[PDB]
């Protein structure tokens, strides 16, 4: 297992869901190679788990400014991949 | 003394209409939860019950009853009405009711014939 340490760069969250995000994003990165598809996989899996709807981006060079639901916003780094995921809707 | 009694009989008394609206809402709605299908039935029963009670009063008033029933989803609700009549005789009564999941605003207007 490639130990890609997670550095979560912002979160209005509980910790358990943040670590779920880290683990499943690591799983998606291990499973797929397309940033759009990584975000897609993570978005469906949280939509299934903690009820819709989120918005997930996976990439290297991107900047974001959105409005999210309270206690439902995370943004972290795995390896060289920044992953944002916020619930709004 | 007789003139006061006649005026009270012929006047649009607000609290009586308010209690009529309460009785109509309680009978038609009660504690049942909001359902899209039953909204039309609830509104029709409320309005017809209010109209029937207002007519049974025997007062020479043309009665106008409007009912709004509302799902509670965080949306603010405001109903306003500014109208011209002869304020000495005609009257209006707007009453708001609510439960855990529903609002209900009923406006009854009585106009002297």
């Amino acid at each position: 297992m490639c130990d890609r340490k997670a550095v979560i760069k912002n979160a209005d969250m509980s910790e358990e869901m943040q670590q779920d995000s880290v683990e499943c994003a690591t799983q998606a990165l291990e499973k797929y190679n397309i940033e759009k598809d990584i975000a897609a996989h993570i978005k469906k899996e949280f939509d299934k788990k903690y009820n819709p709807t989120w918005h997930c981006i996976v990439g290297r060079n991107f900047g974001s400014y959105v409005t999210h639901e309270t206690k439902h916003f995370i943004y972290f780094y795995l390896g060289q991949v920044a992953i944002l995921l916020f619930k709004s809707g | 003394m007789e003139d006061y009694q006649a005026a009270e009989e012929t006047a649009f008394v607000v609290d009586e209409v308010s209690n009529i609206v309460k009785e109509a809402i309680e009978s038609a709605i009660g504690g049942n939860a909001y359902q899209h299908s039953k909204v039309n039935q609830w509104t029709t029963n409320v309005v017809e019950q209010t109209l029937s009670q207002l007519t049974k009063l025997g007062k020479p008033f043309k009665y106008i009853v409007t009912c709004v029933i509302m799902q509670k989803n965080g949306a603010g609700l405001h109903t306003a009405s500014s109208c011209f009549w002869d304020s000495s005789t005609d009257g209006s009564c707007t009453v708001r009711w609510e439960n855990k999941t529903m609002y209900c605003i009923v406006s009854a207007f009585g106009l002297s014939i």
């Binding site: 340490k5 997670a6 979560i8 760069k9 912002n10 979160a11 209005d12 969250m13 910790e15 670590q19 | -």
Partner: protein, 145 residues
């Protein structure tokens, strides 16, 4: 609003603490920096720094956006308290007149029946005292009137 203005007082009591906590965060935001240049292995359940800093900035912004705003519109509350204390003074004068009229100091009245009457008077007098003291405490807590 009393309870509300109570919480209003509460939020002022938090302001200093906010600054306090803020500077702690400042101290913290230095120490955690050492953490990465001392090569720390950050645990998974460790909530990472930027998370808390973002959400705390959001906290402070929302508080100072809305609590202050709701604080300025207090004139309606001010006039409500004014009329409330005016009614309290009117009821106090009415109770004064009732006490002057009600004086059972004469010995002809039955001690038990006059005792029950004085007990009803003392119950409503305690209610009046509670009303007066709660109006005064709301006035001094709001402290703008």
């Amino acid at each position: 609003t009393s309870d509300a203005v109570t919480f209003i007082t509460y939020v002022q009591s938090l302001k200093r603490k906010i600054k306090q906590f803020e500077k702690q965060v400042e101290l913290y935001r230095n120490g955690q920096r050492l953490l990465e240049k001392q090569r720390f292995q950050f645990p998974p359940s460790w909530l990472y720094i930027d998370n808390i800093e973002g959400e705390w900035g959001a906290f402070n912004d929302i508080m100072r956006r809305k609590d202050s705003a709701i604080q300025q519109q207090v004139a309606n509350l001010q006039m409500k308290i004014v009329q409330e204390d005016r009614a309290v003074e009117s009821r106090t004068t009415d109770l004064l007149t009732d006490w002057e009229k009600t004086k059972p100091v004469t010995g002809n009245l039955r001690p038990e029946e006059a005792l029950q009457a004085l007990t009803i008077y003392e119950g409503k007098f305690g209610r009046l005292k509670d009303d007066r003291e709660k109006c005064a405490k709301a006035k001094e807590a709001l402290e703008l009137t």
